[PDB]
Symmetry: C4
Subunit: 459 residues, 4 copies
Amino acid sequence: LRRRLKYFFMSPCDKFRAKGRKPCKLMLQVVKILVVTVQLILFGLSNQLAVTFREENTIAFRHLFLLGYSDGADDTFAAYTREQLYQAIFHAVDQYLALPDVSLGRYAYVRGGGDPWTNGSGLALCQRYYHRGHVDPANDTFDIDPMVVTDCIQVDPPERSSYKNLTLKFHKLVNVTIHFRLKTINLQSLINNEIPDCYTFSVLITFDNKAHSGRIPISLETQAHIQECKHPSVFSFRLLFDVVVILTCSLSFLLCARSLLRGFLLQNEFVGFMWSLWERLEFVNGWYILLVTSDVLTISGTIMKIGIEAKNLASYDVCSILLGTSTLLVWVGVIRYLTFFHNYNILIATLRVALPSVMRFCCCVAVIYLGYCFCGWIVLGPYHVKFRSLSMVSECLFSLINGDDMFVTFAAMQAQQGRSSLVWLFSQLYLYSFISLFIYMVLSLFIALITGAYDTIKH
Amino acid sequence: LRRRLKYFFMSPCDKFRAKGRKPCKLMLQVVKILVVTVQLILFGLSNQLAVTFREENTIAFRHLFLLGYSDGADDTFAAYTREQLYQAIFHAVDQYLALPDVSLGRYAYVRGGGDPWTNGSGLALCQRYYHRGHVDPANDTFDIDPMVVTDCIQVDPPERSSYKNLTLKFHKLVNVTIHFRLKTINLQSLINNEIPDCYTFSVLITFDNKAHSGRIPISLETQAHIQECKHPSVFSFRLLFDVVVILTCSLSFLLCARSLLRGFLLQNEFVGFMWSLWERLEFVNGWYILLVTSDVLTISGTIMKIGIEAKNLASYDVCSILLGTSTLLVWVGVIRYLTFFHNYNILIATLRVALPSVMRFCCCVAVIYLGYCFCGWIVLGPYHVKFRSLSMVSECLFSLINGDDMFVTFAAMQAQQGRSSLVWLFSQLYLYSFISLFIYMVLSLFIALITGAYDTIKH
Amino acid sequence: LRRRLKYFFMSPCDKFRAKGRKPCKLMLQVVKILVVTVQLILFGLSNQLAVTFREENTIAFRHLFLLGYSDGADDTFAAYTREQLYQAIFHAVDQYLALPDVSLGRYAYVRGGGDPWTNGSGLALCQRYYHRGHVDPANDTFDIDPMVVTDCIQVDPPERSSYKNLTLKFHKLVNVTIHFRLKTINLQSLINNEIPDCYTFSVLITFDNKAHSGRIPISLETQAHIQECKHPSVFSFRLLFDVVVILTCSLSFLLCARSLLRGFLLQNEFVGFMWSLWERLEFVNGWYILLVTSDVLTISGTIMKIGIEAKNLASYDVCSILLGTSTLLVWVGVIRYLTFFHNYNILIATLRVALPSVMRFCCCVAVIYLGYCFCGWIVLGPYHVKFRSLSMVSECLFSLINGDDMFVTFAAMQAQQGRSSLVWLFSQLYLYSFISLFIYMVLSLFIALITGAYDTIKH
Amino acid sequence: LRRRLKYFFMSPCDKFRAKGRKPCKLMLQVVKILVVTVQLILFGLSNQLAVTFREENTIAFRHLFLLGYSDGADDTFAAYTREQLYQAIFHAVDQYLALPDVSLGRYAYVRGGGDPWTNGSGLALCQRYYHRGHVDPANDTFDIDPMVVTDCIQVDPPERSSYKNLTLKFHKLVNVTIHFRLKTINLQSLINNEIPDCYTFSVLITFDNKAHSGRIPISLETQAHIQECKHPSVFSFRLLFDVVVILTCSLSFLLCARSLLRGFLLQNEFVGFMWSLWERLEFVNGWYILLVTSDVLTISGTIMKIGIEAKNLASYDVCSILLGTSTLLVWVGVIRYLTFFHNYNILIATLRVALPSVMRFCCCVAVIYLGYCFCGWIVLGPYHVKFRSLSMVSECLFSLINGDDMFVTFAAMQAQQGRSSLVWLFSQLYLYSFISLFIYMVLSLFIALITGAYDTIKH
Ligand SMILES: CCCCCCCC(=O)OC[C@H](COP(=O)(O)O[C@@H]1[C@H](O)[C@H](OP(=O)(O)O)[C@@H](O)[C@H](OP(=O)(O)O)[C@H]1O)OC(=O)CCCCCCC
Ligand SMILES: CCCCCCCC(=O)OC[C@H](COP(=O)(O)O[C@@H]1[C@H](O)[C@H](OP(=O)(O)O)[C@@H](O)[C@H](OP(=O)(O)O)[C@H]1O)OC(=O)CCCCCCC
Ligand SMILES: CCCCCCCC(=O)OC[C@H](COP(=O)(O)O[C@@H]1[C@H](O)[C@H](OP(=O)(O)O)[C@@H](O)[C@H](OP(=O)(O)O)[C@H]1O)OC(=O)CCCCCCC
Ligand SMILES: CCCCCCCC(=O)OC[C@H](COP(=O)(O)O[C@@H]1[C@H](O)[C@H](OP(=O)(O)O)[C@@H](O)[C@H](OP(=O)(O)O)[C@H]1O)OC(=O)CCCCCCC
Ligand SMILES: CCCCCCCCCCCC
Ligand SMILES: CCCCCCCCCCCC
């Protein structure tokens, strides 16, 4: 039993010397790195083109349908008078009706197909307002039933004006929306020698009055549905490569599962020979757990990628996350091979022995960090653009700790020095104390912990 | 006496083993953390909505009343000709008179109510100028009595033009102001299921000629007064939770005060048994001082929060500071529980033993920092936007020390290289010497001090 | 043989004491530093002027020929309607025809000279479209032969309108281009007392429809061909200095080659006397390899500079790279002289002994870095402007590691929090984990390695 | 002699115990710190107001006289067509003539007074062009005599149009300038209770054609001459405080000079008693050299400040530099008092013993830094806005070393990836290698040197 246990923990070179068995797993892992990386690169190159097509079409729609729109104004684009709102709505509808003769793109109309469109209707112009709304600020009185009523006007696309009678219920208006769909063909595909696919853009223009604040923001959003074109005509490798990736990962998974099973069996035998828990876990190869996880992630992502490229699936985000995480894991796995050489193993072991104390110090530091997050959010959120939400506060503080965006953070508060002196003084104390504590003490202690770990490894 | 003293300094686990008393204080502190954090989160979520409502209304007012206003121009918005100023004033008044038929919001006029409005007056247009002003730059002569005279024109809101005869005394003009109030109802409250409240915005538009420089900046400011609406009609938990918070903190305060009293009594007995000062202070639990302070802050802030939510108080800033500081303190207090475990206590003790030498080094560094602040303010303030005031200078230098906003600081001075060579050379010397000294020596010494403290703790 | 070997490894001072030979090489290296730096400075000063001339002319062309152009809009300048595109094209051609009477510069027309211009034609207006294109998004049908057909209209410059009949094939349009050349004389040369040279600017205006997305970007580019003017008349040192530089570097190269040859001969003799590889390499003077490389680079760059200044060559980039790299190398070579003094040699030796472990740690860190690069590119590239390409991803991550541009990176993802919650959560995990791992562990270990190297050198 | 030498090197407390002499110098230094800081603060507060007045007047002039000017366009404001240039010139002159009826400021005209104005002329409009200029780019021919001829038109201010016949020699034009003077009174002074002073603004508008590039930049500059108004009338402390400062610094200078003289005499006696150089220098009190320098600088700056405040001097820059440097020095001098306490002296001595090795390492690092500066300037200057000049290159590299403005530096080169692949690859290599070398090795070694100095001091 002792000889088998000694062989189990041998290095790959020692194992080969002892038994001369073929190191299939190592070469398989190298091939897996190569093929997984190539697949990720090809997938990303393909996806960037579709992203660009959708973005360009959406920008063109913003320039076509939003009255007075200019680049960079998305966050502040809003109406402020009744005539401005009416003009924006009518301009959007008129541009929709004039699209064939003015657009640089080639778009087809879509009619019907369920709500909010009636049969034969291409554009839906809907206003949503409270069922009953009486607002008398002069008497400080109001009587509102907050049930939302929707009233829609249906516009049919022109054959190649009732909507002008729209009357908005301003005092009880919740929002106005314009919905329509446009079909186009993505000719850009021919650059990559692909067959062009057929896009349906669902366009929603929102005039939002939920704040009831006298300012109505205006936005345009699109959702793209992609299909194979019914009759494509332009005067294999990808699917085969995906199959190769799947087979490689399946073989790797089988071999790693076999190794883990043998490890478990040897662990049980050794435990029996002795007639704790960490001693048992010493038999587990964490690198093989990592490889099995990467194999599962890659197989799932590749199946999803095959589905997406056939236009049967649209879950780009999940596929990308699976493939990217698996690629990260397989690239991290390379460190195992470096661990077999002493000069690299010393550094890897330095990090490994440092990690526990670093995590304990993180436990100590996290409570202070959270206290600062909450305090900053409650006090500075009303006045500081970077403190509006807790996640934003955490991002700001984390960036400050690493010496980024500090002066602008200080400068945003200079406007309130005369307005609210107490708030400005508190912000001074808060920012200075936080930055000093975290940069000059916490980071120094992280450096000291790593240095001590290195010293103990080297001696 | 020795047994009681030994029991006094026992850890909570040791205390429980020795006497098996109920650890009410510990569970109470955990509950306090939870409830205080929840209260802060709810208060912040409620306050953000009101902040947003006020901000949106103010932006809408800027777009409605300021001629030619656009987003982002607040700092530079100004008039430069007499006709520009007249047009801006008249546009503001005309928009005030036309508000009912053009605004997307629903506003009611307010009349009278004291100065600067007469009875029945909705808008006050006042010009302030020197009592006697004679300015003859051709003869380098002037005769001014700097007493300020105010002349106001009162405009009544329309029933649902004397102000056009305004004649500005340009050569002696101090400023022009437009004051008016608008009442509205905050319907947005219905999103959070709250009852809408009644807002009165006090709007002040200032055309400022204090510099007498040929450039007159124009600004709009608002102050919001919030009341319960007299007759609200929409087709408990908060107050009870605030009461629960107050009771929890009162119980914690009583227990901590009892512990501190027992500590004082034991200290007196021990001193008597011996028939210095720090030896006496060794009997004081600093964590309990922190807990008592947090309890007091939280109780005060919760009372103010109850007052504010009933529209009897408007001191949002003080309440927010109290609650945020108390939350920070209670979250910091968690470190006491970590001190009871050796592996975390080593790190906490490292920071504690480092602190004194760090403070002494800060004493050494502060005088150099202040000298640089004064020198930079006096020399570069005329030329550099980031050196206008001493607080701004301190913010700039502190950001530079942490590697932020450095290149822009250097680049601002590139314009003066040809204008004033001496100033540019001095700025080069100043910035390079400051940054090098503070980054490559001071920060390195902070790191060295922390490392030495860690080494001495570990050995 | 032992005495000769001892003399070979002696320091320059020891060598001079032993034999009193003239230290020609050292003084030659000092002179080389001086002359090479002076040559680089003069070359850069001369090149900046031509760069500025070309840039100013190009900006003027953008203002002259691009309808509605303004500074800062280069990246977003685009057309969105058919009439916008027609107006832009016609405006460019009309401005070309009106240039003599409106331009502030002095330009001459160029006719003929090969494609795309016919004989006597000054301007070429060409549209490129697919040979056969039928696109029916209504039926999800298309029939395209992607062979590109070019149709050009030739405009002759006016004597000191068929192009108005242009009909664009919008549905199959690939792009539109406008080509023309303008000749000018660079009078600015007189500032530096140089003789003005004759420029020919080749101007290309592109209206790009490759994306077929409804948005057509518009760009203007120039290529400058510089010649000696045929008959210049304005009412030596450079060539001589270049010759001096070449001679200095040739002498240095000869001396260094002699030293390397003697080193090789002594190495062979010592090997023979012993009747490994690194032992042999110990005889090689790396500083002399550096000096020989710098001499070769400088001689090549100086020949190219002579050719360029005579208008016989236009390879500015290669010449600049050669001269700059050689200057960097010669300035780096100064460290050799510092190595001869103990107090500087300790620091140099600290860096030298640290380098190997630093490189091994870089091997360990690079795989993690690459995994993060790939994962970030695939997942965040669709949503984040800084993750579009792999090189951009590497730049972003490298900047994040050094505490730059962090908050903006976090803020770019705040828009997708509501759109795609999964992507936003993944981005949070990705960014936080990457930054924490690389700043708080990797950089700390680099510091620890350098500190250990310094400690071992000092003891 | 031994007792006197021992007393000489005693600390102030030891000196007082030994002889009980009055420590006048110490209290005098404290008073000096106080009064010098107060003087600097008052001077800076006074200077900021004048700076603001001049800046506001200049901005108003830009809005008044520059056709189509808007804030933020100073760097790019330029003309591109002949009609644009004519319109800008005529608009400036017409606004000058209409100033009394349109300006919000109160300005008086200035006539005559030497060149460029004739007697009775308020505005001078001058074009400068080459004496002989023939430019024929069609034939690649030119004949230029570069002697500059100036032709001026004189406009008299209106009494409360020949300039319209201006014909510009475009092909030989060097520049166009408009010169005029405006007198105003600074009423803003009344805010600080000062007596208003009389300003004369000299306004120069330049249309610059030196590049001959088809783009003519337009700029406006002002120079302010300040006088006491002849007959001021508005319905001491500063001079007395300046005198007090001068007396305090004179007394401090006398005492420090006496101490230095006694040190020199004791050094000579000790040298004589022994019947090297650094041993002699050990007798010199560097803090007293610093105090003497600060006294001299403060006295000079205070005399200049007195002159300036009386309107007899206008050298604000030199006065500010003197006073700021003296304030910095006096604040730095406080460290001497901290050196007398052991716990602060250990840190001060750590920095002192670290300084030499840090300077030697700086010698080693500077040559590499300079090589990189030259290489980057020559190679990337044509393409990168941050590499235009050597000082700008140094600022950029220094900021990069400290982790600032890194991603934007990388991003500026992304445009040239397709244009010039070789340059982009070189920029990648250059930036990555520089940043890595300087952050991961050089800064780490600075940290190691400081840590070693601290360790040797502590042991
Ligand atoms: C659970 C399912 C298991 C499937 C695999 C069953 C086939 C099978 O045993 O192959 C042996 C080798 C294994 O290749 P590989 O895994 O590289 O080789 C093993 C490892 O070196 C292992 O060390 P660690 O990796 O450190 O644990 C070692 O203990 C084993 O020695 P031992 O056997 O004496 O205990 C080796 O056999 O593989 C091939 O030669 C490729 C052909 C694969 C054919 C499968 C086609 C699907
Ligand atoms: C000044 C006013 C005092 C008010 C409290 C008086 C009631 C009272 O003694 O309760 C005992 C425990 C204390 O709970 P708690 O404070 O957790 O328990 C004490 C701590 O463990 C203390 O250690 P340190 O915290 O390290 O100092 C220890 O020395 C005491 O032992 P000793 O007594 O033998 O000296 C413990 O009694 O509390 C309850 O069991 C909850 C019921 C609270 C009822 C109050 C309702 C308002
Ligand atoms: C391969 C072609 C070689 C060309 C040079 C042949 C002429 C020639 O030997 O000059 C001797 C000295 C060398 O000057 P230089 O190179 O400075 O001097 C040598 C170095 O000090 C060398 O040390 P390292 O540099 O550390 O290796 C040392 O070993 C040699 O001693 P040794 O000779 O006893 O072995 C020295 O002669 O140079 C002149 O005195 C300038 C006149 C140059 C005339 C060349 C005009 C073109
Ligand atoms: C070169 C011109 C010298 C002018 C000063 C001549 C007057 C004069 O000796 O005053 C003695 C003290 C000095 O005050 P102060 O300088 O503070 O005192 C001296 C320092 O403590 C000095 O130590 P270090 O500072 O470390 O070198 C020490 O060696 C001297 O002892 P010793 O004398 O036994 O050698 C002290 O006399 O000063 C006053 O009591 C104020 C009245 C100043 C009156 C001056 C009005 C203008
Ligand atoms: C052993 C205790 C020593 C305490 C030293 C504290 C020094 C405080 C200086 C604060 C400067 C900001
Ligand atoms: C023991 C004293 C040694 C002093 C060494 C100073 C070196 C100065 C170099 C300055 C480079 C900027």
